Amino acid sequence: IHDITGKDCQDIANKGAKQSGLYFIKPLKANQQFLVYCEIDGSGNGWTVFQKRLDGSVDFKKNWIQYKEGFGHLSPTGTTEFWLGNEKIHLISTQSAIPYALRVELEDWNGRTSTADYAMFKVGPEADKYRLTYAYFAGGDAGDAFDGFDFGDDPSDKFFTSHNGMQFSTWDNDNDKFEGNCAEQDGSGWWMNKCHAGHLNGVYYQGGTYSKASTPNGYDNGIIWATWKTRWYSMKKTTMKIIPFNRLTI
Ligand SMILES: [Ca+2]
């Protein structure tokens, strides 16, 4: 664990840290410091990573408290899977009304990475079930899955599968817009609607391709981002990371 600390990984970078790895941060309002993985590039950008998928090592079917507190494994090398914790993500993303960007980074099973950036990304408090909000989609070749997607299933698919303004759901705390339980169905925690167009906490399907035949109920419950790949393609790696918004300004 590195010595420099701050409010987030950008503060850490601003204080002269140059190496990606594990650092303590202590956002405003946090009761105690906590470890994070910071990705620090050669241009002084320090991203605070809150989700990582890369190998299927961690089961993302976790309950409300586990999603609140965080689960999985932090590593200095950035080679482990984790969910940082909704309370931590709330504390970082809302502190001092600092505008953060979210970057979603996806890797397919062929070694291509794509990104989707969201401006002014926030996660609300537990009293509002950790609601996700953003101001606008700021671009990227992965496309805007959080806007919802037309799967050709129902006329209202886009309304059913958008993510801005969705509360967080787990199997034991359903806050979705579905008469069923999206989190229980898929076995994940996420900002579910009815249910999703972008869902990075799904099941780790080896090799990417899966199908309705994969499960008895034919769930599209993989690690999906429908504006980049079919619902029947599950990413090999994902990263969800945040940075003060100005670090995006060219
Ligand atoms: Ca429901």
UniProtKB/Swiss-Prot annotation:
Ca(2+) binds at residues 174, 176, 178, 180. Detected in blood plasma (at protein level). Together with fibrinogen alpha (FGA) and fibrinogen beta (FGB), polymerizes to form an insoluble fibrin matrix. Has a major function in hemostasis as one of the primary components of blood clots. In addition, functions during the early stages of wound repair to stabilize the lesion and guide cell migration during re-epithelialization. Was originally thought to be essential for platelet aggregation, based on in vitro studies using anticoagulated blood. However, subsequent studies have shown that it is not absolutely required for thrombus formation in vivo. Changing residue 186 to Y: In Kyoto-3; impaired polymerization. One of its GO terms (cellular component) is platelet alpha granule lumen. The chain holds residues 171 to 420 of 453 of the full protein. Glycans are attached at residue 164. The keyword Coiled coil applies. It comes from Homo sapiens. This is Fibrinogen gamma chain. Transmembrane segments: none annotated. Heterohexamer; disulfide linked. Contains 2 sets of 3 non-identical chains (alpha, beta and gamma). The 2 heterotrimers are in head to head conformation with the N-termini in a small central domain. Residues 230-250 are annotated as: Gamma-chain polymerization, binding amino end of another fibrin alpha chain. The gamma-chain carries the main binding site for the platelet receptor. Keywords: Blood coagulation, Calcium, Coiled coil, Disease variant, Disulfide bond, Glycoprotein, Hemostasis, Isopeptide bond, Metal-binding, Phosphoprotein, Secreted, Signal, Sulfation. Changing residue 164 to K: In Kyoto-1; causes accelerated cleavage by plasmin. A long coiled coil structure formed by 3 polypeptide chains connects the central nodule to the C-terminal domains (distal nodules). The long C-terminal ends of the alpha chains fold back, contributing a fourth strand to the coiled coil structure. It is found in: Secreted. Disulfide bonds join 9-38, 182-195.
